[PDB]
Symmetry: C3
Subunit: 490 residues, 3 copies
């Protein structure tokens, strides 16, 4: 002789945060943040990266004799470099526009080394005495591999005139250099002429260099210096050289065969023989969630980065404002396993739990729609990129550093605020549905039943399981049971 | 004998989107996105722009013999330049700090050309014979028109000392240059002196230049090069020149008569003899909408730019919820309902007809109207993109500039879309509650004198004419006077 | 017989704004925007700042004879410098990499000046004739105090070879310079040799300089120029000099003893004897509010800067979707009620008095405060502006810097105003729901023993005293015990 309505409860212990409350327990939830990595360096889509162990970019390109296992390299997906490489320019000096060169290296996937000037093209100079103790090889003085140090022969240094014509179909990378001597006497011992120069000219290049003879402090046990330069040669251009002395000549060059997407990564983790689709300087990520907090700089197809600790979305009602879930209904039911809103009946034939599948489905579609919307709306988000600056560009370096942290905080704020508000609306949405269900039954049985305070109703007239289906379907005939009602209400 | 409550509906098919639902049909809506353009270039508030057809900025300042239609130029509003101009420095070379000069040129709206150093000032050098085949004019050798190339006369090149003292009350722009020779023999053929120099000095400038002699590849048929420099002279300063050879001397200069706001646009569209108030590289914009999606770079008064495809607001009821009235115990709207969003249908014995609830429609009208205005005002301040240029060796800075401007357009696009989704959700429920409140207001006044059907209508126990049913819509329904009569019929 | 329902009211006149409506009057509201400053410069945390009165950073480091008040300085917290320092570089010239030096100075809190090259280490050269009328001192020619201008003694200028080794366990700052003559004749008078050079070399430095001789315009009273350079010498490193003319030798250097956080401020305000925790160029702020609108650039712990004019958070309900309770079906509030926000008034035969409801006012107060704290917590991290300087030929980079920090301020301003406007709308709803939810509880329990009247209160046909009728606030009522006589009470 009773019909009652309620909601479904379970053993869940998930907890979400709203604007006005924290640690609220819900029946069903799913996390959307990734916090784990494998702690290794692994292949990107089946292509091994290029790992420069203890060499800088300059040491590899100029051919530092100490680390020369990189004489020939296959294709690479990205470049890995340590924080402070040990083997760099061995003879003290510098490389002009070092940072601008490394920006070019981030868009190249393959190099090919070719020989452009054989050593036989220096008949009137000495090509075998350019060794130095600052660049040792197996305990003996040596020098760089891709360049030649020319000194006088038979007490003379005739002027040099040479040219190269690019006949390939790709661009070339060329490097040369100049030497700064110590004193006037040392200048004549190496190159006979007392005043020297170097001039280089292409279709867009025009240069002249003069040595600086002065006194400097010892670096690696030497007081001399060497400066290096580079350029890109077009497929049908030519380059011309001319010098009197202090010249470091090119021997080998690089062809740019494949152009693509890559990065230079600073890390110290070991190679681990894997395959993956997302890589970070601290490890690899394998997940399908839309957010992660591992590291700001990544390569590949990755989830977006936020500086958060947790991000949980609620997909169920409050576990056990229209005042229905908390009030008029003390708590949920464990017996109603199937649905989310349902009925409980008390009858002479028996009792049981029944669920309203129609209203249950409407809620599932409504919330699943919302969840897929949050993933979509955050598709476009700031992606960090690495840039480098030298010691006299501190102003620009600071400007770059603040711009990237500025966007990181904006998107972290947006993600955290969005989760908080949608966790609140979901809980109100579930509450409203149960309130509307209560009214639907109430309007049908206008006077044939009385309210019992809680969700239950007690019937004036006697009925069996049949008209239980009538009320829940809405097919309750008020005039049919109009009699047997006034008699009870005596 | 019977009264009922309902809401207004029509035949519109406009659709909007909320956070929880998509393709929801509404009675009324509003669009806030502009997606059309003229496809032409027009005057900005009545000032014609300056079109450099196949001529670069450098080819216009230094007078390239081909770009001779720009000798005299009136006032302009903005400058239009093609992507890859054909006519540029004809003789091979470069212009120092080209990008910084273009940044300065974006704040100037008029110029005037004056003759600072007449050609009679050089009586011991050859003013003619400075032509070349790299700069042709009507099939004959020529040279830049705003500078002069000086060559030896009578096998001698005396040293030059000259000065100019600004007295025009406005700033001046001056250009000069140096020539690099091919070989040693060429140097003596033209200038007669083996070693040369150029020195220029002002209150803030101290410069010395030396030619470089080397072998270079052919460009435009010539292996020589020419480099040019520029400076700005304050209203009462002076400039001093001294040279031994290889000197390209100034002849004309520009006065900065007018200053203001301008820009340089890269486009290929054609002039349309029209007028406008907003201009984009792809066309002009006529609209009053808050947002647009034509192009990120604009000039003039313009709506804000977003990278979206549709933005529709909702200002009406859902057409055929949280408060369970619009689609709950009220099944649907009334087609015959006009003159009001919410109202009552009356069906007494004297007659039957519809009616409208005044002062319930009006509050909803005022409520939604203020919501729209607040959204427009809150988005007045938005990031505006501006063009900048960098050379081949500034790739790191150029990359940094591009990422900054794309980052801000992503943020503001996210803000605009989120606001529209949320306010649409509130508006739908705002209409839902107002119907529910009206339904409850009648139920309390009526009390037990009527029996509620359960569909949104009430059936009167006591017979009541249009006068007392008008009193229900007054809210002056007098329960006691009809209370006793309804009793007897109740049984 | 009567027990009505109502809500608390007072005489407040605070106003808040929502999305739907502006100037809503509420009982209690907070303010979270600070708008006052003292207008003086104070000590940051008990450390007085360094105030350069009429000098520049260059004038202080290279001792300008006028700026002799700053010969020895104590530890500072930040540096104050006027807009256009009058005393700067008495002898016309320039300082190389000026802006990069100032950026380095922003992370230093203390210097110590030491002597490295005594005057006695210059025999065979003249050390007392290097004075000029451009640096006047007490109306008699003088020169910078940290460098020496060397002139020929007898009629010769022997070459110089000097070296210094850093053995101080701390980094050093060293300055030197070169002099550009006016004429060949003037060159021989000061230094006998006609062709000169300067060579400087460290572990990471390799430089060579040559004078430029030309005619220039008069700045101050002189046509000569001087160029100065600087470097940082790491511990256990040496610097080597060599020249034969036009050399401005170092005499004093600065040690870097304390590193930390500092800044350089462009202000014209005056020093007042006070200490603070936040400092702006306009004044000092002393408050606990979350936001402020004084100035973008600050130092110390400070509220976040926004560009708004008013940020008021509503905390109490309005004073005399929308659940119909507060403004409808309950006309106005109660002035007499003071104990809580919501409560029950009663009128028994014995007397009439107001009462209060706990567990309801408690949850409303608990809810509102949690919302306020979460707003403040969510704004913990926000963009903070820093100062940077660029010279005259870096206009593109300077414009880029301005647009970036302007864009971030508009983004964070938008978030603050949007967050407030939405929570104001939600809060006024929250009180409305509580009023109606209470009304359901009382109506539900008195199912038929009471006759609802529609004004918010119930009339019991039945009679019982304060022990029972008031016993309904506790939530305990026995329907059966009073059902019989209520049923027997019929007409
Ligand atoms: C105290 C003293 O004078 N000692 C002499 C040695 O010089 C000392 O040791 C070297 C390592 C430096 O630290 C010196 O500063 C120091 O005083 C001297 O060794 C030779 O000194 C000369 C000085 O100019 C030079 O450094 C020599 O360098 C070589 C080298 O690297 O070993 C020799 C190479 O063959 C040569 N390569 C050529 C010719 O292409 C170069 C070249 O000389 C310079 O690099 C040019 O800049 O490097 C160094 O060996 C010793 C003689 O063996 O005599 C000691 O009395
Ligand atoms: C050597 C050969 O096979 N051909 C000779 C011509 O040179 C060839 O054609 C020219 C266009 C270039 O491509 C050369 O590289 C090529 O070998 C030669 O023509 C003259 O060549 C000289 C080379 O220096 C020079 O280019 C002359 O060009 C002019 C010019 O630009 O038009 C002539 C002008 O009158 C002169 N102007 C002044 C102020 O004197 C300029 C100027 O001297 C230079 O630009 C300075 O850098 O040069 C070109 O006519 C031909 C005649 O000698 O002989 C062919 O055998
Ligand atoms: C009309 C005329 O010719 N007047 C001569 C004076 O020059 C005039 O006034 C000076 C201030 C300048 O404005 C000149 O451009 C102007 O014509 C001349 O005064 C001296 O002129 C010389 C050369 O032009 C030089 O500036 C002198 O400057 C001094 C100074 O400041 O007083 C003199 C110092 O002793 C000297 N210091 C050293 C270390 O030598 C420097 C000087 O600048 C150095 O030579 C470095 O450049 O400063 C200036 O007094 C006057 C001399 O008798 O003759 C007038 O006929
Ligand atoms: C580099 O080699 C190219 C390629 O052969 C040469 O330029 C050629 O010049 C000849 C002369 O008429 C012509 O075949 C073409 O103008 C060029 N060749 C091609 C295939 O286009 C020249 O030797 C060098 N070019 C430069 C610019 O130095
Ligand atoms: C440019 O000429 C003007 C006008 O002669 C110079 O300005 C001053 O003019 C007054 C007026 O007689 C005189 O004191 C001098 O002729 C000038 N004095 C000064 C201090 O400049 C100006 O000198 C000239 N420009 C320069 C820098 O030489
Ligand atoms: C500055 O002087 C110090 C102390 O004399 C020098 O350091 C010594 O250098 C020599 C030669 O390299 C070594 O044998 C000593 O062991 C060093 N002593 C110490 C305490 O480091 C230093 O080299 C000098 N500076 C320079 C760059 O010449
Ligand atoms: C929420 O619950 C977790 C789990 O114990 C706890 O660590 C955290 O402090 C709680 N937060 C609050 C505000 O109680
Ligand atoms: C990623 O994780 C999934 C789930 O365990 C697994 O099936 C897949 O093999 C993993 N891929 C890699 C490359 O580790
Ligand atoms: C909404 O309507 C658009 C346009 O008619 C259609 O392309 C889209 O698939 C619809 N979305 C859904 C969820 O039906
Ligand atoms: C711009 O649009 C309006 C209508 O929006 C139209 O009346 C007007 O003629 C158009 N052209 C100009 C120049 O305003
Ligand atoms: C309706 O109410 C108004 C009071 O606002 C009154 O003036 C008017 O006479 C009423 N109409 C009828 C028919 O009673
Ligand atoms: C709200 O009231 C203030 C106080 O007088 C007034 O300045 C402001 O204009 C009012 N705003 C509106 C929208 O009425
Ligand atoms: C700021 O104001 C408070 C409260 O009036 C006061 O106690 C405090 O001393 C003030 N701070 C300073 C630095 O004067």
């Amino acid at each position: 002789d009773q019909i009652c309505i309620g909601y479904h409860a379970n053993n869940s212990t998930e907890q979400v945060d709203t604007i006005m409350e924290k640690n609220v327990t819900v029946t069903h939830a799913q996390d959307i943040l990734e916090k784990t990595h494998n702690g290794k360096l692994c292949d990107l889509n089946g292509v091994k990266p290029l790992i420069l162990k203890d060499c800088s970019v300059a040491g590899w390109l100029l051919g530092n004799p100490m680390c020369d296992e990189f004489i020939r390299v296959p294709e690479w997906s990205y470049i890995v470099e340590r924080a402070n490489p040990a083997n760099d320019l061995c003879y003290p000096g510098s490389l002009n526009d070092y940072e601008e060169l490394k920006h070019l290296l981030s868009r190249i996937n393959h190099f090919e080394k070719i020989l452009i000037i054989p050593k036989s093209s220096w008949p009137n100079h000495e090509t075998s005495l350019g060794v130095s103790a600052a660049c040792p090889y197996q305990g003996a003085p040596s020098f760089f591999r891709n360049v030649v140090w020319l000194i006088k022969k038979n007490d003379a240094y005739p002027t040099i005139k040479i040219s190269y014509n690019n006949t390939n179909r790709e661009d070339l990378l060329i490097l040369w250099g100049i030497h700064h001597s110590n004193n006037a006497e040392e200048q004549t011992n190496l190159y006979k002429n007392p005043t020297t120069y170097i001039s280089v000219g292409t279709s867009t290049l025009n240069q002249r260099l003069v040595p600086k003879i002065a006194t400097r402090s010892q670096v690696n046990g030497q007081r001399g210096r060497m400066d290096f330069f580079w350029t890109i040669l077009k497929p049908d251009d030519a380059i011309h050289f001319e010098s009197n002395g202090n010249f470091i000549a090119p021997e080998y060059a690089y062809k740019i065969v494949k152009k693509g997407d890559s990065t230079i990564m600073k890390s110290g983790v070991e190679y681990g023989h894997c395959n993956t689709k997302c890589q970070t300087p601290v490890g690899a990520i394998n997940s399908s969630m839309p957010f992660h907090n591992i590291h700001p700089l990544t390569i590949g197809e990755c989830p977006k980065y936020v500086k958060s600790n947790k991000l949980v979305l609620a997909t169920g009602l409050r576990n056990s404002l229209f005042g229905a879930i908390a009030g008029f209904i003390e708590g949920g039911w464990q017996g109603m396993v199937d649905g989310w809103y349902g009925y409980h009946h008390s009858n002479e034939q028996g009792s049981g739990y029944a669920a309203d599948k129609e209203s249950t489905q409407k809620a599932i579609d409504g919330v699943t729609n919302k969840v897929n919307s949050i993933i979509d709306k955050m598709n476009t988000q700031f992606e960090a990129v690495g840039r480098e600056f030298n010691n006299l560009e501190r102003r620009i370096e600071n400007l770059n550093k603040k711009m990237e942290d500025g966007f990181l905080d904006v998107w972290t704020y947006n993600a955290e605020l969005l989760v908080l508000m949608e966790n609140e609306r979901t809980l109100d949405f579930h509450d409203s549905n149960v309130k509307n269900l209560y009214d639907k039954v109430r309007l049908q049985l206008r006077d044939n039943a009385k309210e019992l305070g809680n969700g239950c109703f007690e019937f004036y007239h006697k009925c069996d399981n049949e008209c239980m289906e009538s009320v829940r379907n809405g097919t309750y005939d008020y005039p049919q049971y109009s009699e047997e009602a006034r008699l009870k209400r005596e």
